[PDB]
Amino acid sequence: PCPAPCACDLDGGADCSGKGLVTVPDGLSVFTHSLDLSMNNITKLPEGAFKGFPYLEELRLAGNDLSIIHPMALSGLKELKVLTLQNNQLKTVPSESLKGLVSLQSLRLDANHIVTVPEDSFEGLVQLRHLWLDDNSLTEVPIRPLSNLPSLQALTLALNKISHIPDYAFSNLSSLVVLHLHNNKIRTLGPHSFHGLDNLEALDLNYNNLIDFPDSIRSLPNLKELGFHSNSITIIPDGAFVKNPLLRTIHLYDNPLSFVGNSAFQNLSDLHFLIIRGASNVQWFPNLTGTNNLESLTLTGTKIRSIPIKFCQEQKMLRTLDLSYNEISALVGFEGCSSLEEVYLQNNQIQEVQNETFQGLAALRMLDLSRNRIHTIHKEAFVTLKALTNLDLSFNDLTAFPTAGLHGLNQLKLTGNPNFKE
Amino acid sequence: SQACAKGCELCSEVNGCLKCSPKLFILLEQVGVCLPSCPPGYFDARNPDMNKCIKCKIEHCEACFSHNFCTKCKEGLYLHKGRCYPACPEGSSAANGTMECSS
């Protein structure tokens, strides 16, 4: 039952890994399934080495240094559910080795050094679901071989050299759900590039070279999780998301934002988490009118000097608010935001706190007022926050710090007051 | 440190292994480990700098592809898209012989 090196276990599963071997094991357990062959020095794969093993479900070839695979080495064994080839020296997609697996639901090609992706690749694999290509050398979205995969709901093209995505490049993946394009050279995206994926809930464009806002997402009806960050986008246009009412997540941070479209964040209603950071030129707090439900909001690095008087009327859902590092020169009622827990106002122009500013926040825990112009705190209400624990007043104009309702503070930061300096 | 050989590029018994040999991921919680293909219920993630492999926010998942997409559900439940439910939602009918949700 147990070939010597391998650790024979459980019922079906076998573990030969770590360590460690060349070629295959002596003992053929013919009733075995779920083989782990990973983490060894295995130079090449001979044909028929996998013929001796039928019924097999999952196979792990990862962790090897593998230059080349025989086209018939996998024997065409029809029961293989998933194949992990990651972290190997494969210089190309072994499209010939992958033919005849109709049961394959998941493929790991990532961490290989792969440049060429043959046009006949992924043929017959229509049962395929989740595909890994990342930390490869790829310079272009492998369109045609990608079109043989109707059942694919998870694709990752990330950590590659891909600089441009042509229109209709994803056209034939009808079931796609998550697409990871992150960490590329991507500069331009075709207007129709995302045509074809009506099922995508998740788009990752982060850590790319983009210039203009990716309107290609206008073709994504089911989109929920969205990011494009550490890009060069200078502009978020009107009705940017208008075709995407199901977005619950948007990370746009670290983009040299300049103008933001008034109509851009309006009427979203599904939006939960919104992250903006490093937009140095944006002067006006976005119009969120229509977007009444937000758990978490972030505006950082802007020139915004003020906040909408009405902001907390409709925001009743909001747990976490970060306005740190802006130009904000004054404050406004935070009552009505009662769901609030973490509030970050540090590095602003705020000179005051008032009796009613924080009035009625039961949930407030962290409160960051450090690095501001604060001198006095009006009619001293922190009294109303029973939850308050971390409080940072460091570096302001304060000569006196009001104490009431400060019971149970674990951390309190008083430093740099008053400074003076001046 | 001196003569720490095993599997990882810089290893110190002060807080476990750091900076793994490429391309492998780090584990946490006593404290830190280096391996390929993070175990259940972690998901393997990759960056240029950090190979940090994380836990999914998807309930009761053995193997995740991402934050919100699950590839292999836990023994009890049915998998519809990336998310795991006890009762296959309709929506679409359940399959049989294995736990999956087919439309």
Curated annotation (Swiss-Prot), chain A:
Extracellular domain ranges by topology: 1-422
LRR repeats (start-end): 28-52, 54-76, 77-100, 102-124, 126-148, 149-172, 174-196, 197-220, 221-243, 245-267, 291-314, 316-336, 337-360, 361-384, 386-408
Disulphide linkage map: 2-8, 6-16, 312-337
Subcellular location field: Cell membrane
Positions bearing carbohydrate: 172, 267, 287, 355
Domain LRRNT: 1-30
Function: Receptor for R-spondins that potentiates the canonical Wnt signaling pathway and is involved in the formation of various organs. Upon binding to R-spondins (RSPO1, RSPO2, RSPO3 or RSPO4), associates with phosphorylated LRP6 and frizzled receptors that are activated by extracellular Wnt receptors, triggering the canonical Wnt signaling pathway to increase expression of target genes. In contrast to classical G-protein coupled receptors, does not activate heterotrimeric G-proteins to transduce the signal.
Family under the similarity heading: Belongs to the G-protein coupled receptor 1 family.
Protein name, entry field: Leucine-rich repeat-containing G-protein coupled receptor 4
Organism: Xenopus tropicalis
Gene, per the UniProt record: lgr4
From-to range in the entire protein, with total length: 30 to 451 of 955
UniProtKB/Swiss-Prot annotation, chain B:
Effect of residue 32 to E/R: Strongly reduces activation of Wnt signaling
Outcome (variant: residue 30 to E): No effect on activation of Wnt signaling
Gene name, Swiss-Prot/TrEMBL: RSPO1
Segments forming a coiled coil: none
Residue ranges of FU repeats: 1-44, 50-94
Name this polypeptide is given: R-spondin-1
Residue positions the entry lists as glycosylated: 96
Consequence of substituting residue 81 to A: Strongly reduces affinity for LGR4
